[PDB]
């Protein structure tokens, strides 16, 4: 019931919330949005919205590396995805794309505690000061 | 005078760890002359300790190496204290000696 499609409003508000609160507090960020939970917010951050994620075409090297690795460790996408530097869902889609296109008074009264200054080789007798 | 006690022990150990590092290093590290990063070095301490609790390798891009070898030293000490305490408590619960509501949940989290 809570599940559904992601909205530009929810997604931008997710950007701002993640910016303000920080990465480790999910319940606080899920509190602001409606119809979405904390798990969904976190996985939605790390899966897609995260700026460190690389959204662009795959170069030739990334295709060589992806194909080789996928033939090395079949069906393991969460192991391969960090090695090529792409999202697991993304490299999946691209792979099926490659096979697809490959064929109180202490203050104010009396001076709290008083230290009269000590007296030294000079005359302080005379000195007094003006009012305000 | 107050006597160390079970309620106060974790607080006590971290209190005198903050003091241990503070006295040692601010009497050890110095020449800042004004105030040298005491609040800050301790925040690096708590940061590192959280990172080791989360098993996240903690590397600050800039930092003096004596400060880093410092934090890694004391953090490893507190890790040894915490871990040994965890082992011991699991032994007590295993034998079924201690009935406490808190030490069971805590000890669980530790393992």
């Amino acid at each position: 019931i809570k599940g559904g499609v992601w909205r530009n409003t929810e997604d931008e508000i997710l950007k701002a919330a993640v910016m303000k609160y920080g990465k480790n507090q999910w319940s606080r960020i899920a509190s602001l949005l409606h119809r979405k939970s904390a798990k969904q917010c976190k996985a939605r951050w790390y899966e897609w919205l995260d700026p460190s994620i690389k959204k662009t075409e795959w170069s030739r090297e990334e295709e060589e590396k992806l194909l080789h690795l996928a033939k090395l460790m079949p069906t393991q996408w969460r192991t391969i995805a960090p090695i090529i530097g792409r999202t697991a869902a993304q490299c999946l889609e691209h792979y099926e794309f490659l096979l697809d296109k490959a064929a109180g008074v202490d203050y104010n009264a009396e001076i709290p505690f008083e230290k009269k200054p000590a007296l030294g080789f000079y005359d302080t007798s005379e000195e007094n000061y003006q009012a305000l | 005078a107050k006597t160390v006690t079970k309620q106060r022990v974790e607080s006590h150990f971290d209190l005198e760890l903050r003091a241990a590092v503070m006295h040692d290093i601010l009497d050890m590290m110095p020449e800042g002359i004004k105030q040298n990063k005491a609040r800050t070095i301790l925040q690096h301490l708590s940061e590192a300790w959280r990172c080791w609790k989360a098993n996240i390798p903690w590397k600050v891009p800039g930092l003096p190496t004596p400060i880093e070898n410092m934090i890694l030293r004391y953090v490893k000490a507190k890790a040894d204290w915490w871990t040994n305490t965890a082992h011991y408590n699991r032994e007590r619960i295993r034998r079924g000696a201690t009935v406490d509501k808190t030490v069971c949940k805590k000890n669980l989290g530790r393992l």
Binding site: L72, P74 | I41, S46, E47, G62, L63, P64
Partner: peptide, 27 residues
Amino acid sequence: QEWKIPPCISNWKVHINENFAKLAEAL
């Protein structure tokens, strides 16, 4: 300058072996 301390602004408060190739191609 050396004793500038990075502010500890708080966040709270990978390689692979080639043997996998030999194995996988073997299977």
